Symmetry: C2
Subunit: 412 residues, 2 copies
């Protein structure tokens, strides 16, 4: 027809693997008890770098679903996604053999895919020669393989792609899945993000950009909005969500955890590695999410800020939040706990926003003790506020001028 009927999109389950937990309970446990996951880099000899802290996953449940041989097949970035997606499926009680697999899609966002494999194989190539590049290199490295792997693991035949917008990647991944089910192209979506770039190269890259915090004290390294913030801390991990059409969830009596109601996407089109100091594009991004969500500024009870713990970020971000929502709405950045997961940021912060609602609890911004003079946003720190959160948003601002905002509605 000339028209397309809209559907409501709900979250029925989610999985996660991060520096602060490999299950929803552990994960949320860490947030509510203020237990951060930042510590000394153990993944490699950082003795020569300017950065010595990172949020690693040092207790990854490998045996649960994998066998040693799987390391010749997937890079950590893919392992994380697979695990997360499985947990999400187990959590959503989604029986994939009961699914209309053509309406079943997967979208796994990522900023740099298997950068570790790339680094390694590039050395092999230049040490031993072309004849020495492992055949499974590209299948492990290519940024889209996670999407395929997750799809291959659950027989999803629907829409399958990976989106890349740096730090905003998984926020855009969930948004596209949102729009997809909403306009009726798919019924179920496995969507989230994964990152595994705590490699010498990735760190060397961001350090050269001077974006990584050099603070030696793991507890003052990631302090979003704090006047002493000097860069973001690299984290690693993946977060997967299972989205379905309201109609589909009900038809199988699934347990709705929350609901996706808005998605804003804009581009600063200004600075190439930073967001507008005045959050010009971020503002519109928020307005767009709210517009789609048909709700107004006042109804927003919580904002999970990008809060990368960088001077420029928090300046622009607080600005835009105050411009649209105000100085009353609670603002916290959980990157203070998990570090910056980059392509996986959006996904994990969505789980934070969702659980926050399901617990009537606004998680704090760990480490933060003295907010910058100029930040007029109601930043939460020291400890977490208990509050009824009917509507909440989660922001992400990637390098390149990418802005993405997801709007959620607590389930009735």
């Amino acid at each position: 027809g000339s028209h397309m009927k809209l559907n409501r999109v709900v979250v029925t389950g989610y999985g996660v693997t991060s520096p602060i937990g490999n299950t929803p309970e552990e994960f949320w446990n860490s947030l509510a008890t203020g237990k951060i996951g930042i510590g000394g880099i153990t993944k490699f000899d950082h003795s020569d770098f300017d950065v010595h802290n990172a949020a690693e996953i040092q207790d990854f449940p490998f045996d649960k679903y994998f066998v040693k041989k799987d390391t010749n097949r997937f890079d950590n970035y893919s392992l994380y996604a697979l695990y997360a997606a499985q947990e999400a499926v187990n959590h959503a009680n989604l029986d994939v053999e009961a699914l209309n697999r053509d309406r079943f899609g997967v979208i796994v966002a990522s900023g740099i895919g298997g950068i570790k494999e790339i680094e390694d194989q590039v050395l092999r190539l230049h040490e031993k020669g072309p004849k020495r590049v492992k055949p499974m290199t590209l299948p492990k490295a290519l940024p889209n393989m996670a999407s395929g792997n997750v799809a291959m693991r659950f027989g999803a035949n629907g829409v399958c792609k990976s989106i890349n917008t740096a730090c905003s990647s998984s926020n855009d991944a969930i948004g596209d899945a949102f729009r997809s089910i909403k306009f009726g192209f798919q019924d179920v979506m496995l969507v989230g993000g994964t990152e595994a770039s705590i490699t010498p190269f990735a760190i060397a890259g961001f350090q050269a950009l001077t974006a990584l915090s050099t603070t030696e004290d793991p507890t003052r390294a990631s302090i979003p909005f704090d006047k002493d913030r000097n860069g973001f801390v690299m984290g690693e991990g993946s977060g997967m969500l299972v989205l379905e059409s309201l109609e589909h969830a009900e038809k199988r009596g699934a347990t709705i955890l929350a609901e996706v109601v808005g998605y804003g996407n804009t581009c600063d089109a200004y600075h190439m590695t930073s967001p507008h100091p005045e959050g010009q594009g971020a503002i519109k991004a928020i307005k767009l999410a709210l517009e789609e969500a048909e709700i107004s500024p006042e109804q927003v009870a919580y904002v999970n800020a990008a809060g990368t713990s960088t001077p420029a970020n928090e300046k622009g971000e607080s600005g835009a939040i105050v411009a649209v929502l105000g100085k009353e709405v609670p603002v916290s950045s959980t990157k203070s706990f998990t570090g910056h997961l980059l392509g996986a940021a959006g996904a994990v912060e969505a789980i934070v926003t969702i659980e926050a609602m399901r617990h009537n609890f606004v998680p704090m911004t760990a480490g933060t003790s003295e907010v910058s003079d100029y930040i007029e946003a109601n930043v939460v720190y020291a400890q977490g506020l208990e509050k009824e959160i009917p509507y909440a948003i989660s922001n992400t601002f990637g390098f390149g001028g990418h802005n993405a905002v997801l709007a959620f509605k607590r389930w009735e």
Copy 2:
């Protein structure tokens, strides 16, 4: 409301930089005269590789829009996109200062971004040390930067992202832009793809996978559907299209070249580096495009095949085409000319499909002389057929099980 009104999406201009031309006329000139762009690799010392041919751009119009300093800012993969997008804008007479820049978005797909910069900087890191990684490394390398750069260059404030599905990347990029304008989220879109992976590493990677043709004769290296095909040839370049809502094009009296009417996206969810031997997912992908296009198999007058010139690809692809459309509809793979542009494949093959329509000409599949016994599709070779092409589709099948099909309608 409960509903969303749909819009028609039209193409008003396109730009391109490839091994067979850096302008629409030159580009189409090469296709109609059977002039392929494959030749000996000149980008690096391939004396030690098993592959010696690639489709390079050796006459890239650098001075037209760039200054030497821009090489410290962008990797070739971004330069290509910028040039292509500019040509597309110049071609579409799109005055960006007349635009409602919030309804103006950019989506540049890519499979591996600035892999060249990554390779180089990874060596620097391990030669000289961390303190030696160039600060502009990530801004040049990250797969999403092209999207941002193109957005930054034309003030697009709308939707801005990069999609990654390997060989199907720019086909999915145009599809998302299609859906975006169609459901009224944007009015104008700068969308296409770019690839610049003719580097020692990229080649070493695919060669290890045994996906690259080892045929020394540049003219028999890329022979889609030919019984002697032994792998695909790596190409490089970018193709950008300017899409607008029918209503927007008319409102400024733009010149409509063609129209986007369908988009199918599915995942094989079978083999991790190849498409189903029976093209199970490819079929549905086509059916989906046709379904959205509200047209039937018979109305399709041309199919621009993925035709990667690999045994497995053409087998599954011909199968699916014959299963849905039949053995009558003309089938040609222009990768025989340009090589496989990967993330840029979709974009450039769309320009081929569009021009094909605007010229009532079905371009041939260069090099191909003896089609495989088992291929029952009406493959075009030896020379090009003249035919009225009212509706045509263009396919792409990336590693990971990604399938994407774009449907076009010749403009009335």
